[PDB]
Amino acid sequence: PLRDLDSEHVSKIVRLSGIIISTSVLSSRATYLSIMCRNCRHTTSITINNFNSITGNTVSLPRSCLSTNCGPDPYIIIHESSKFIDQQFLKLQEIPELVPVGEMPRNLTMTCDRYLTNKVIPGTRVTIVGIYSIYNSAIRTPYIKILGIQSDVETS
């Protein structure tokens, strides 16, 4: 149950169900991009295939020429050569009837990418397989990476 999510579930695959109430706009992310030194004119190619799905951008641009002067932050992204993938943010809420009587239903921010984007519409009742995770805005914000969307039978 969405209310039963616990710190013991962090970074573990969790099975849970709810209702999709909002689907954010597709945001394009980087999976392979070509960069250049403004001084060295030194081409390079960074790959971010390893979980380009956290909310924050992790594998960042280098601040010095490869193997290391070059000058801090000399890298510019060559956009016509990079390759991109899309990311979409969903927000899940507990089933409205299965909630404490006078308490706002608990909603949890969720993220998906690649072929799982544009798979649901708001109001659909879905079952989620994904990695319970932690995002820093001492406290932390929980969220779920999407691994699979078991979309139930919905309105035709």
Binding site: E97, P100, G123
Partner: protein, 328 residues
């Protein structure tokens, strides 16, 4: 984090109740529900540090160590199922239960029978999707003012499972209508169903039934007819489920039931609204000197028994558990 506010009973008159932020850690989380008195002990810690007040001022937060409700009432064990069978074997058990319904009230046994019927409810059924039949019994209390319809509904709230209390008009935490509202402090959308949706597998007590808004009336009609409230706002297109038994209290037109008129002229509700009901018990005021005498004796005894300085029915807990097990 749980925000604790002083109980209004102990607050001296004229003073604003104060809120203190109680911090819960480890397995202490989700051991309480809002609106429930608590008795918690912990460190009165000084919170970390705004220049809003100008002077150097720190916030305070009470870290918690042990919280006990002042007080699973619906839990089960083999011995109490044996007990349930034993009391069920009695004769006149129906009358015993009816006398148990609303023990604080005197008279109107028809109302007690109706509310007991609504609580126990009919058998839910679904013929493979071919035919669907409501498994709930809806009770309407159309009575003259000051006949304890409100108190009866409060008792039902106390004694029912998955029970929500809604009002026809005014201020309430449940609005009988599905809505998509954004909390300004947190700035995000929430899909909140009405009291009908919240009471998906229980009862919904609707007081001031005649004094409903048009939207509330339409939502009531939808819930009573199709048992599924549908929402089509802010991009959310879905049909929430609400299979609820409605116990409603309404006032006849003019604050008094006119007997010479039919039910149509006595209540502003239209016929399609009433037809979905099952037990339409009109609580007409009766002018009998002896009945009034017995009522006054009951009221006076109760009122004197409540003074701070001067001082066959089934027990309520057994009624709770037996009703739950019967429905389950």
């Amino acid at each position: 984090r749980v925000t604790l506010q002083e109980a209004p009973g102990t607050v001296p008159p004229g003073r604003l109740p104060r809120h203190r932020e109680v911090i819960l850690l480890a397995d202490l989380v989700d051991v309480s529900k809002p609106g429930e008195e608590v008795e918690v002990t912990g460190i009165y810690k000084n919170n970390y540090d705004n220049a809003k007040n100008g002077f150097p001022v720190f916030a305070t937060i009470i870290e918690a160590n042990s919280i006990k409700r002042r007080e699973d009432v619906f839990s089960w064990t083999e011995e109490e199922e044996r007990e349930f069978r034993k009391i069920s074997r009695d004769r006149g058990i129906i009358d015993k239960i009816i006398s148990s319904m609303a023990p604080s009230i005197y008279g109107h046994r028809d109302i007690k029978t109706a509310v007991a019927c609504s609580l126990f409810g009919g058998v839910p059924k679904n013929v493979n999707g071919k035919h669907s039949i409501r498994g709930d019994i809806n009770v309407l209390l159309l009575g003259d003012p000051g006949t304890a319809k409100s108190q009866i509904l409060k008792y039902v709230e106390k004694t029912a499972h998955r029970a929500v209390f809604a009002t026809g008009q005014g201020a309430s935490a449940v609005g009988l209508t599905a809505s998509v509202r954004k909390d300004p402090i947190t700035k995000e959308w929430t899909l909140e169903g009405g009291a009908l949706v919240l009471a998906d597998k229980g009862v919904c007590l609707i007081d001031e039934f005649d004094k409903m808004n048009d939207q509330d009336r339409t939502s009531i009609h939808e819930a009573m007819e199709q048992q599924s409230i549908s929402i089509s706002k802010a991009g959310i297109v879905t049909t929430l489920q609400a299979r609820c038994s409605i116990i409603a209290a309404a006032n006849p037109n003019g604050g008094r039931y006119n007997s010479t008129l039919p039910l149509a002229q006595n209540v502003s509700l239209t016929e399609p609204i009433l037809s979905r009901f099952d037990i339409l018990c009109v609580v007409r005021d009766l002018v009998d000197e002896e009945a009034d005498e017995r009522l006054a004796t009951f009221v006076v005894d109760s009122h004197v028994r409540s003074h701070p300085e001067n001082d066959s029915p089934i027990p309520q807990e057994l009624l709770m558990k037996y009703i739950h097990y019967a429905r389950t």
